[PDB]
Amino acid sequence: SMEAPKIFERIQSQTVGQGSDAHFRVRVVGKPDPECEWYKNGVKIERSDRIYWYWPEDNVCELVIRDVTGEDSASIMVKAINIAGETSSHAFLLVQAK
C-alpha cells in the first residue's frame, strides 16, 4: 500500500546577500519515504561542497546554497518522488549585491 508524496510545508522564497548562504526546506511524507530532488532554473542540482541537500529531520529535506553570487538568482524547485507519485514545491532565490 504505497502512498504518493505529500508536502506539508512548502518551500519559501529567499532574498539573500551575495556571499551569504541560501536555505530551503520542505516537509514531505510518503510511503515509501520519498526521494528528494532540487532544481535551480530547471537544472537538477547535484551535490558539491557549495550546494547540496540533506535530511535535517526524517520528513524535512533541505537545500543549502553557500556563498551565493548574482549567478545564483533563480527559480528553486523541489520534487519529492517515490513509486506512487511525485509532487513539487516552488520558490525563487533573489541575490542582492553588497
Query: How many degrees, rounded to 5, is the angle at CA 72 between CA 6 and CA 80?
Result: 15
Method by which the coordinates were obtained: X-ray
CA distance 57 to 91: 21
Inter-residue contact 55 to 20 (CB < 8 Å): no
Inter-residue contact 34 to 59 (CB < 8 Å): no
Nominal resolution (angstroms): 2.1
Q: In the numeric block, which cell numbers belong to residue 95?
A: 541575490
Residue 71's φ and ψ, nearest 5 degrees, are -65, -10
What domains sit in the chain, N to C, each tagged with a CATH number?
1-98 (2.60.40.10)
